Amino acid sequence: MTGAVCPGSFDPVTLGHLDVFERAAAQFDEVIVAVLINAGMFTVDERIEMIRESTADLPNLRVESGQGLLVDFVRERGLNAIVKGLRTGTDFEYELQMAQMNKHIAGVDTFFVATAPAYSFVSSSLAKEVATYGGDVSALLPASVHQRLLGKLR
Amino acid sequence: MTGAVCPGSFDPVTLGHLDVFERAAAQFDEVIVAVLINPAGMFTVDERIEMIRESTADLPNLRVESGQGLLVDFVRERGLNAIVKGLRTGTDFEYELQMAQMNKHIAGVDTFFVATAPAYSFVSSSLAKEVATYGGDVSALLPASVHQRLLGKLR
Amino acid sequence: MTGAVCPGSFDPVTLGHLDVFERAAAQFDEVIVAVLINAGMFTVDERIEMIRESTADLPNLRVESGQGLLVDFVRERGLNAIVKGLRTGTDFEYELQMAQMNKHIAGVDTFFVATAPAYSFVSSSLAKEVATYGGDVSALLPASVHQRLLGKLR
Amino acid sequence: MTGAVCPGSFDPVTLGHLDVFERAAAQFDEVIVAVLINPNKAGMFTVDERIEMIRESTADLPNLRVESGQGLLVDFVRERGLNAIVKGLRTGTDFEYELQMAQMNKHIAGVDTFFVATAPAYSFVSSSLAKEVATYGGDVSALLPASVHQRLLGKLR
Amino acid sequence: MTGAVCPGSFDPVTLGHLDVFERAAAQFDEVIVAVLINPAGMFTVDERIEMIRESTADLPNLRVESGQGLLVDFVRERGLNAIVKGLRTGTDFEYELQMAQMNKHIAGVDTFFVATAPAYSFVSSSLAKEVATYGGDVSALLPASVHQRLLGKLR
Amino acid sequence: MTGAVCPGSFDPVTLGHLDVFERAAAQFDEVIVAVLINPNKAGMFTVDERIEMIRESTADLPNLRVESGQGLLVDFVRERGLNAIVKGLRTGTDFEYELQMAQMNKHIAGVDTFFVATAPAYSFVSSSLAKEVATYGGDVSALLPASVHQRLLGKLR
Numbered sequence: 001m002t003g004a005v006c007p008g009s010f011d012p013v014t015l016g017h018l019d020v021f022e023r024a025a026a027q028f029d030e031v032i033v034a035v036l037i038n039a040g041m042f043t044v045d046e047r048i049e050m051i052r053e054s055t056a057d058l059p060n061l062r063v064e065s066g067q068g069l070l071v072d073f074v075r076e077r078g079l080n081a082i083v084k085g086l087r088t089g090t091d092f093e094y095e096l097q098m099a100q101m102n103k104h105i106a107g108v109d110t111f112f113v114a115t116a117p118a119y120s121f122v123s124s125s126l127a128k129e130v131a132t133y134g135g136d137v138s139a140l141l142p143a144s145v146h147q148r149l150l151g152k153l154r
Numbered sequence: 155m156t157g158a159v160c161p162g163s164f165d166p167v168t169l170g171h172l173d174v175f176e177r178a179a180a181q182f183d184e185v186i187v188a189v190l191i192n193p194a195g196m197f198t199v200d201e202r203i204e205m206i207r208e209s210t211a212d213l214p215n216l217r218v219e220s221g222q223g224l225l226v227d228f229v230r231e232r233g234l235n236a237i238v239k240g241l242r243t244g245t246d247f248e249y250e251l252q253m254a255q256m257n258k259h260i261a262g263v264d265t266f267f268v269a270t271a272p273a274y275s276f277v278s279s280s281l282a283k284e285v286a287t288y289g290g291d292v293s294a295l296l297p298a299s300v301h302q303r304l305l306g307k308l309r
Numbered sequence: 310m311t312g313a314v315c316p317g318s319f320d321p322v323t324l325g326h327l328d329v330f331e332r333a334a335a336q337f338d339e340v341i342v343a344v345l346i347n348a349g350m351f352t353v354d355e356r357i358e359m360i361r362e363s364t365a366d367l368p369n370l371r372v373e374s375g376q377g378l379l380v381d382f383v384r385e386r387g388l389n390a391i392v393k394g395l396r397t398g399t400d401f402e403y404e405l406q407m408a409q410m411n412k413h414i415a416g417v418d419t420f421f422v423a424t425a426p427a428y429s430f431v432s433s434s435l436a437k438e439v440a441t442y443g444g445d446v447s448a449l450l451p452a453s454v455h456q457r458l459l460g461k462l463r
Numbered sequence: 464m465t466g467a468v469c470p471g472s473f474d475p476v477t478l479g480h481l482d483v484f485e486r487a488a489a490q491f492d493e494v495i496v497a498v499l500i501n502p503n504k505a506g507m508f509t510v511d512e513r514i515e516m517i518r519e520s521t522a523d524l525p526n527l528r529v530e531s532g533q534g535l536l537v538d539f540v541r542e543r544g545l546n547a548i549v550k551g552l553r554t555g556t557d558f559e560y561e562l563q564m565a566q567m568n569k570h571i572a573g574v575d576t577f578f579v580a581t582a583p584a585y586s587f588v589s590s591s592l593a594k595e596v597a598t599y600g601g602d603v604s605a606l607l608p609a610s611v612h613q614r615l616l617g618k619l620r
Numbered sequence: 621m622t623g624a625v626c627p628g629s630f631d632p633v634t635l636g637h638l639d640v641f642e643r644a645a646a647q648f649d650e651v652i653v654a655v656l657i658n659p660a661g662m663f664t665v666d667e668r669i670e671m672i673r674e675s676t677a678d679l680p681n682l683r684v685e686s687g688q689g690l691l692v693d694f695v696r697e698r699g700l701n702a703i704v705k706g707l708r709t710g711t712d713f714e715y716e717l718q719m720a721q722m723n724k725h726i727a728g729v730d731t732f733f734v735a736t737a738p739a740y741s742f743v744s745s746s747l748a749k750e751v752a753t754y755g756g757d758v759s760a761l762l763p764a765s766v767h768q769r770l771l772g773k774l775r
Numbered sequence: 776m777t778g779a780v781c782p783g784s785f786d787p788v789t790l791g792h793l794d795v796f797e798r799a800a801a802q803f804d805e806v807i808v809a810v811l812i813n814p815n816k817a818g819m820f821t822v823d824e825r826i827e828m829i830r831e832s833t834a835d836l837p838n839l840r841v842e843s844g845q846g847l848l849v850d851f852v853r854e855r856g857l858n859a860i861v862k863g864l865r866t867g868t869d870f871e872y873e874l875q876m877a878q879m880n881k882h883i884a885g886v887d888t889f890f891v892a893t894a895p896a897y898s899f900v901s902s903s904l905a906k907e908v909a910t911y912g913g914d915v916s917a918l919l920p921a922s923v924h925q926r927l928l929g930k931l932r
């Protein structure tokens with residue numbers, strides 16, 4: 001009965017995120033991708049759809065939106081583990097601070113995993129920025145996502 | 155007669171801050187906590203000063219004052235030339251180093267850093283407010299009087 | 310059928326290590342503590358005994374010695390996950406390098422978890438060094454370990 | 464025919480920037496200082512003021528020129544027939560972000576990025592910290608070229 | 621006429637090293653790879669030079685030489701005053717910065733750092749040898765000729 | 776009655792060390808420089824040579840004294856009725872290790888550790904790098920006090 005939550009804004013989801021989803025799904029019985037909501041490029045439903053489309057091959061993963069404390073999202077689903085990816089540019093010190101806080105207030109563990117080197121320099125923000133000015137990020141995003149991103153720009 | 159200034163916004167003061175205040179007061183003849191007013195937060199400057207005074211009642215050589223503008227001017231105006239700053243998990247240490255070197259260059263003021271105790275190393279004013287807002291229990295991370303006032307602002 | 314390997318030299322095991330063991334054991338069905346062998350303070354068997362004594366309350370954890378490639382140790386037991394703790398003084402850049410190498414050569418994932426703040430400044434080496442010169446590290450080691458350490462010094 | 468681009472907002476240029484310009488000009492046949500502008504946020508100085516302050520403090524470097532631009536840095540570089548960026552490191556540099564951008568820039572355009580550490584004396588100045596300190600009266604005269612300092616005080620008053 | 625020196629022990633040269641060599645040769649008129657002999661490794665200096673030459677056959681403006689003693693002397697003796705060093709995962713960047721500032725101070729030599737490609741970012745000479753020794757496959761991380769010679773030393 | 780201990784091997788003392796000594800002496804009533812010795816590994820300089828080089832370059836600091844010791848730093852500190860350590864930071868400092876040791880020292884003995892960044896000009900010198908560079912003929916004269924430099928060259932020849 002093992003399980004972990006993979007949280008983020010995923011605006012949009014990248015291959016970096018997808019790599020981490022796949023590893024979490026390979027090592028825990030149950031994975032929930034938690035889509036944080038609050039004003040980015042994609043609506044929550046769009047972000048959820050894009051993740052669902054890219055994770056179709058992952059039978060034990062589902063996608064849900066949430067707000068408020070992440071630890072509440074995790075605990076309300078009977079779990080107490082978070083899996084978070086590391087990339088180039090990750091504010092790791094802040095992630096550690098949040099991990100220790102989350103353990104303190106709710107007994108939830110956080111496991112960090114480095115994304116694959118090939119996907120280590122992509123972030124949602126940098127991909128949007130580059131694509132905005134016409135750079136090719138098609139190798140860095142799921143095929144579906146890439147087409148829909150081009151859609152919001154053009 | 156030795157002395158140091160401990161600067162911050164303290165909105166609100168945490169046990170991380172208090173740990174640092176205590177270590178400074180133990181090591182310098184005089185300590186001034188400088189509550190730095192900005193372009194803004196949850197507590198007023200007077201409220202912040204009051205919460206710090208409550209938390210530091212046992213420290214006779216420490217006083218609390220508000221300030222604005224250049225930190226090194228605040229320090230030198232009070233006849234001192236040392237700053238004591240704490241380090242926690244999530245501190246932007248590279249920025250703190252930059253500012254310390256800048257402050258030494260422009261005014262000859264030294265900066266001493268001390269790591270807060272591991273128990274208080276993941277608390278910050280911002281994260282404590284954020285967690286409390288959504289109903290997380292941060293009472294082990296703040297002075298008792300502060301936690302009481304935080305509930306009040308949120309209710 | 311989930312599982313992870315927790316590797317180290319554990320010379321001796323600390324409460325920092327034990328914290329990580331407990332979290333791994335809480336989040337995976339099966340945990341194996343891998344005791345690396347090659348000249349420290351305790352023999353391999355002693356290190357193993359000390360870990361077994363300190364993990365008696367963890368029914369799904371066992372302790373075994375190993376040498377050679379860690380990924381071989383993991384794969385030969387049907388697993389492909391490593392759980393590694395982070396403490397103050399951890400050479401994280403090196404851990405990331407090894408994690409990426411281990412994924413490359415054998416498809417093994419590495420999950421990192423920060424140890425509890427209270428146990429974040431203890432390491433096997435610093436505890437031995439301090440105890441050697443008479444400092445009290447009894448709050449930082451399992452009760453059994455502490456008595457046996459005093460035994461090797463006196 | 465070697466060449467590199469030294470990019471930044473330079474609002475204003477500092478002695479840390481100038482140190483990097485000089486090292487680049489010593490090691491590449493041509494250097495272009497790229498004054499990159501966000502058309503959606505004004506800085507303290509206009510583009511012409513920024514360029515003027517850089518030119519005045521680089522008059523001794525005959526193989527260096529200064530041009531403004533916007534959009535993708537790698538397009539600025541490639542349209543000039545080059546494929547190298549030279550970027551300085553100081554105290555407070557977000558090096559992880561710089562590494563991310565360098566890998567992305569190599570990925571999308573094949574442009575290389577070379578980092579050089581600025582001189583220790585100029586290692587704690589940044590445009591933003593200089594402006595902030597000067598705003599509140601602190602003396603930053605030793606950290607900025609003469610072409611900048613009194614123009615800065617002028618903007619502030 | 622521009623130029624730079626790329627120093628290291630290269631025991632053995634990796635694709636991480638080669639990536640950096642290629643970028644240097646693309647950006648400077650002349651590149652010298654300096655194979656630095658130490659108080660010791662798996663390959664002799666002549667073997668290391670040979671492996672690098674094999675791997676850099678397509679780079680006409682790059683040459684390979686052995687050296688010892690002070691790096692900045694090696695650089696200045698050849699009429700240059702630039703060093704190009706690569707960065708990978710596990711690089712002790714703080715030490716590299718210290719050495720670059722020292723090298724600038726004592727001899728006026730500049731150091732330019734470049735990050736190796738993500739694909740080659742976790743390989744090092746030491747980790748490649750360690751993995752290969754125990755039968756791990758590092759052939760995607762080394763030039764073909766190098767991997768062939770590594771097997772030989774281990775067999 | 777305030778006081779701090781400035782610990783190290785000082786083999787030899789550098790201008791980076793001296794910068795830290797001076798700041799400590801300016802901010803505490805008394806400073807003790809603790810020359811910590813490993814009785815199992817000789818350095819380049821004997822304990823008396825190390826102490827002599829420090830004393831000669833600190834003659835202008837009347838509230839500073841120099842003493843050797845071994846074993847636990849926190850015992851050296853406490854046996855002198857103090858409970859503060861002042862430690863410098865430079866380029867190449869293993870700060871994570873320093874943080875680990877500071878937390879351990881507070882845990883076992885209640886001693887506080889205060890870190891100060893050394894001056895930029897002295898930020899890339901260390902005893903070990905100075906020795907290494909001097910060994911191969913490099914000029915480190917501007918990074919060491921006069922009390923040290925020719926004694927170093929003497930050891931090397």
Ligand SMILES: O=C(O)CCn1ccc2ccccc21
Pocket residue numbers: 160161162163164168169170171172174238239240241242270274277
């Ligand atoms: O970092 C801590 O937890 C307390 C240490 N400290 C001392 C002054 C100060 C100002 C802002 C933030 C932290 C501060």
Ligand SMILES: O=C(O)CCn1ccc2ccccc21
Pocket residue numbers: 469470471472473477479480483484549550551552553581585586588589
């Ligand atoms: O100012 C420094 O210290 C870094 C030197 N540097 C060189 C190019 C550049 C662009 C933006 C910011 C800093 C820059």
Ligand SMILES: O=C(O)CCn1ccc2ccccc21
Pocket residue numbers: 626627628629630634635636637638640704705706707708736740743
């Ligand atoms: O770091 C890399 O992968 C190659 C970049 N590089 C260039 C010279 C050199 C020397 C030692 C180690 C790495 C080096």
Ligand SMILES: O=C(O)CCn1ccc2ccccc21
Pocket residue numbers: 781782783784785789791792795796861862863864865893897898900901
């Ligand atoms: O040399 C520096 O830059 C750091 C200043 N510092 C002050 C005490 C001390 C002890 C060992 C090493 C360095 C030390």
